[PDB]
Design an enzyme around this catalytic site. Structure first.
Site, short mmCIF file in Angstrom:
data_model
loop_
_atom_site.label_atom_id
_atom_site.label_comp_id
_atom_site.label_asym_id
_atom_site.label_seq_id
_atom_site.Cartn_x
_atom_site.Cartn_y
_atom_site.Cartn_z
CG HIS A 65 -1.68 1.21 1.55
ND1 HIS A 65 -2.62 1.73 0.66
CD2 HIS A 65 -1.74 2.01 2.65
CE1 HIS A 65 -3.21 2.79 1.21
NE2 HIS A 65 -2.71 2.96 2.43
CG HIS A 67 -0.13 5.66 4.72
ND1 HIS A 67 -0.68 4.91 5.75
CD2 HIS A 67 -0.40 6.96 4.95
CE1 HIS A 67 -1.28 5.78 6.56
NE2 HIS A 67 -1.14 7.00 6.10
CG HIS A 110 2.54 0.31 5.09
ND1 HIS A 110 1.46 -0.51 5.23
CD2 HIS A 110 2.04 1.58 5.23
CE1 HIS A 110 0.36 0.22 5.44
NE2 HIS A 110 0.68 1.52 5.43
CG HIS A 112 -2.51 -2.71 3.80
ND1 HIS A 112 -3.43 -3.37 4.60
CD2 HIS A 112 -2.77 -1.38 3.97
CE1 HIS A 112 -4.19 -2.44 5.22
NE2 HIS A 112 -3.81 -1.22 4.86
CG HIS A 397 -7.18 2.87 19.43
ND1 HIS A 397 -6.50 1.66 19.44
CD2 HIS A 397 -7.99 2.90 20.53
CE1 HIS A 397 -6.88 1.01 20.55
NE2 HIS A 397 -7.78 1.73 21.20
CG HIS A 400 -4.81 5.47 7.30
ND1 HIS A 400 -4.63 6.66 6.62
CD2 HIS A 400 -4.53 4.49 6.42
CE1 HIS A 400 -4.27 6.40 5.38
NE2 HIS A 400 -4.18 5.07 5.23
CG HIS A 402 -6.76 2.59 2.79
ND1 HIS A 402 -6.11 1.62 2.08
CD2 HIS A 402 -6.39 2.42 4.09
CE1 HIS A 402 -5.40 0.87 2.90
NE2 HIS A 402 -5.53 1.33 4.14
CG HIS A 452 -6.86 0.20 8.99
ND1 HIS A 452 -5.59 0.34 9.52
CD2 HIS A 452 -6.70 0.36 7.64
CE1 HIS A 452 -4.71 0.61 8.55
NE2 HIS A 452 -5.36 0.63 7.38
CB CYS A 453 -6.64 0.98 14.82
SG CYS A 453 -5.33 1.59 15.91
CG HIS A 454 -1.63 2.92 10.23
ND1 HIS A 454 -0.47 2.17 10.18
CD2 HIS A 454 -1.86 3.27 8.94
CE1 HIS A 454 -0.04 2.06 8.93
NE2 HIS A 454 -0.86 2.74 8.13
CB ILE A 455 -1.91 0.14 16.67
CG1 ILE A 455 -1.57 1.51 17.28
CG2 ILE A 455 -1.22 -0.96 17.48
CD1 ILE A 455 -2.17 1.84 18.62
CG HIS A 458 -4.62 -2.15 18.20
ND1 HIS A 458 -4.74 -0.91 18.79
CD2 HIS A 458 -3.93 -2.94 19.05
CE1 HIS A 458 -4.08 -0.94 19.93
NE2 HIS A 458 -3.63 -2.17 20.14
CG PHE A 463 -9.85 -1.22 16.24
CD1 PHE A 463 -11.22 -1.06 16.41
CD2 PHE A 463 -9.05 -0.42 17.03
CE1 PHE A 463 -11.77 -0.20 17.32
CE2 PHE A 463 -9.60 0.51 17.92
CZ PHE A 463 -10.95 0.61 18.09
CU LIG Z 1 -5.53 0.74 17.92
CU LIG Z 2 -0.95 2.80 6.10
CU LIG Z 3 -3.45 4.08 3.78
#
Ligand SMILES: [Cu+2]
Ligand SMILES: [Cu+2]
Ligand SMILES: [Cu+2]
Ligand SMILES: *[C@@H]1O[C@H](CO)[C@@H](O[C@@H]2O[C@H](CO)[C@@H](O[C@@H]3O[C@H](CO)[C@@H](O)[C@H](O)[C@@H]3O)[C@H](O)[C@H]2NC(C)=O)[C@H](O)[C@H]1NC(C)=O
Ligand SMILES: *[C@@H]1O[C@H](CO)[C@@H](O[C@@H]2O[C@H](CO)[C@@H](O[C@@H]3O[C@H](CO)[C@@H](O)[C@H](O)[C@@H]3O)[C@H](O)[C@H]2NC(C)=O)[C@H](O)[C@H]1NC(C)=O
Ligand code: NA
Length: 499
Positions: A65, A67, A110, A112, A397, A400, A402, A452-455, A458, A463
């Site tokens: 992906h 980002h 990164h 994905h 959290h 993010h 897309h 989604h959460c970007h941790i 998670h 998440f």
């Molecule tokens: Cu999170």
């Molecule tokens: Cu990302």
């Molecule tokens: Cu993204």
């Protein structure tokens, strides 16, 4: 050297020792972080990704992906596995062929697929502006002025328990740093500046989890870009940067020639700087080659606060100046229990058929789409509001979206919304208990967009949800290449999956 906008990119396994401890990794371009992919605004990028992975302990499939790049008309190239594509299998390659109209700033790329980017597949992605409105504020902006912040683990990702509080073993700044336990005096990164010059430092969080308190002893930092969005100048002495966020700041090399500590304190893992953990070196040309002797203040007098940021352009806010003042006002119920996250009562588990392929095959409402309850349709050409009230364990959290950036109508730790001039960005901390961080955008980009959460731990624990934006126009807006159509047959054949 930077690569792109047209380039091959090989994904391999190799041993690396960025903190003195050797482990195998998943690498782009043979390095951690991967090489910088770069071009100019509006360029055609064609990144032909060669999957050369053979170690199953970090997964031999992959997907990448880009980002923060909107992918308008190219949803198939966005990269999230089982949302826009099936993974690329080993020994195969795939051309991510897209354009970047109307965007210029600091981005990153990164893996994905699963938690694979934690195992090393992460690097910077910069779209320069030949007519940058901020150009006169600095002298130098190049590969030497990119600063990456990374968490690094000695345990391989596929051995991290799902839903657990997973903690790193080192902070890496530009790929180097020292381990929190069994600390060895392994090499620290050096960022070199010339006395009197001004630098556009492009600060990129490539974290899988922690946020960092970033500072440079003796120096302050003048923010001019937030997640790709040009800002008014804001001078700070510390930036708290959450996973996947980016800032450009002007560094004025206006202190005495010398060595200064660069500090990145994570919210979990090692606390402080003993033995040179959480550290790198700012060296002025002509300084002695030795470690800094500088200290941090006890408290920082001008930390970044997100509501202080404002766009350089007159971006405004879409909709009406009150809560619910949008065509499609949403409130997500964000929860955690028993090792799994949920959104609106549903924990995300990737489907067998990618969401985009389900839509291209004729499924045309969000209740026809899998996973059931994980896809929300959005109407076209409409103002969307999404309230993201915090409280779920494991915070704060960083959420993010897309395919979009968004106005941050309400930020962490401040109950007052801003319908006039908030910053726009793509990844936002949702704060702490009782907060009501809220975002707005308009739907002018048909396709399924992950939220989604970007941790990354998670996301793996569920998440996430998918916004199926303008389902009726998705197929006409996003013509797909034959190589994309070939991905799911190849992947399912290789994995003995029926579909
Ligand atoms: Cu999170
Ligand atoms: Cu990302
Ligand atoms: Cu993204
Ligand atoms: C965050 O802000 C959102 C708005 O952006 C707040 O949403 C509002 O939430 C209340 C309930 O908490 C909603 O009122 C309730 O509606 C149902 C009927 O739908 C009714 O049965 C209840 O008696 C009550 O009236 C209201 O509709 C809603 N606004 C929107 C757009 O959905 C949310 O409460 C805020 N959260 C926090 C933690 O501050
Ligand atoms: C909490 O968040 C709110 C909303 O983002 C922040 O409120 C905003 O505060 C700014 C800065 O003081 C206000 O702008 C000021 O407006 C005056 C009058 O026009 C102008 O003379 C100043 O130069 C500046 O523009 C802004 O109006 C205000 N907005 C709202 C909706 O209240 C607040 O500062 C944040 N709290 C903390 C502690 O940072
Ligand atoms: Na407006």
């Amino acid at each position: 050297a930077q690569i792109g906008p047209v380039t091959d990119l090989h994904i391999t396994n190799a041993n690396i020792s960025p903190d003195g401890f050797s482990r195998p990794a998943v690498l782009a371009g043979g390095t951690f972080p991967g090489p910088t992919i770069a071009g100019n605004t509006g360029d055609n990028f064609q990144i032909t990704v060669f999957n050369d992975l053979t170690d199953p302990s970090m997964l031999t499939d992959t997907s990448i992906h880009w980002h923060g790049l909107f992918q308008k008309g190219t949803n198939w190239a966005d990269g999230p596995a089982f949302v826009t594509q099936c993974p690329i299998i080993t020994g195969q390659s795939f051309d991510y062929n897209f354009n970047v109209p109307g965007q210029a700033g600091t981005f990153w790329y990164h893996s994905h697929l699963s938690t694979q980017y934690c195992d090393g597949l992460r690097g910077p992605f910069v779209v320069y502006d030949p007519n940058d409105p901020n150009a006169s504020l600095y002298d130098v902006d190049d590969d030497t002025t990119i600063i990456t912040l990374a968490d690094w683990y000695h345990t391989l990702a596929q051995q991290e328990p799902i839903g657990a509080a997973i903690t790193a073993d080192a902070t890496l700044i530009n790929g180097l740093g020292r381990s929190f336990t069994n600390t060895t005096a392994s090499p620290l990164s050096v960022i070199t500046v010339q006395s009197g010059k001004r630098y556009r430092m492009r600060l990129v969080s490539i974290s899988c989890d922690p946020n960092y308190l970033f500072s440079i002893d003796g120096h302050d930092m003048t923010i001019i870009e937030v997640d790709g969005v040009n800002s008014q100048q804001l001078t700070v002495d510390q930036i708290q940067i959450f996973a996947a966020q980016r800032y450009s700041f002007v560094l004025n090399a206006n202190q005495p020639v010398g060595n200064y500590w660069i500090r990145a304190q994570p919210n979990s893992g090692g606390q402080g700087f003993d033995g040179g953990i959480n550290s790198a070196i700012l060296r002025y040309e002509g300084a002695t080659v030795e470690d800094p002797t500088t200290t941090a203040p006890t408290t920082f007098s001008n930390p970044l606060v997100e509501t202080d940021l404002h766009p350089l352009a007159d971006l405004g806010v879409p909709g009406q100046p009150f809560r619910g003042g949008a065509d499609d006002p949403l409130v997500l119920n964000l929860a955690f229990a028993n090792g799994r996250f949920s959104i609106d009562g549903v924990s995300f588990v990737p489907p067998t058929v990618p969401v985009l392929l389900q839509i291209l095959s004729g499924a045309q409402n969000a209740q026809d789409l899998l996973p059931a309850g994980s896809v929300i349709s959005l109407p076209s050409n409409s103002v969307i509001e999404v309230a993201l009230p915090a409280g779920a364990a494991g915070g704060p959290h960083p959420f993010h979206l897309h395919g979009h950036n968004f106005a941050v109508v309400q930020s962490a730790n401040n109950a007052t919304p801003n319908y006039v001039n908030p910053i726009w960005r793509d990844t936002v901390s949702i704060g702490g208990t009782g907060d009501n961080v809220t975002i707005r955008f308009t739907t002018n980009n048909p396709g399924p967009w992950f939220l989604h959460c970007h941790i990354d731990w998670h996301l793996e624990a569920g998440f996430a949800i998918v916004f199926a934006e303008d389902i009726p126009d998705t197929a006409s807006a996003n013509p797909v290449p034959q190589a994309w159509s070939d991905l799911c047959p190849a992947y399912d054949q290789a994995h003995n999956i029926s579909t």
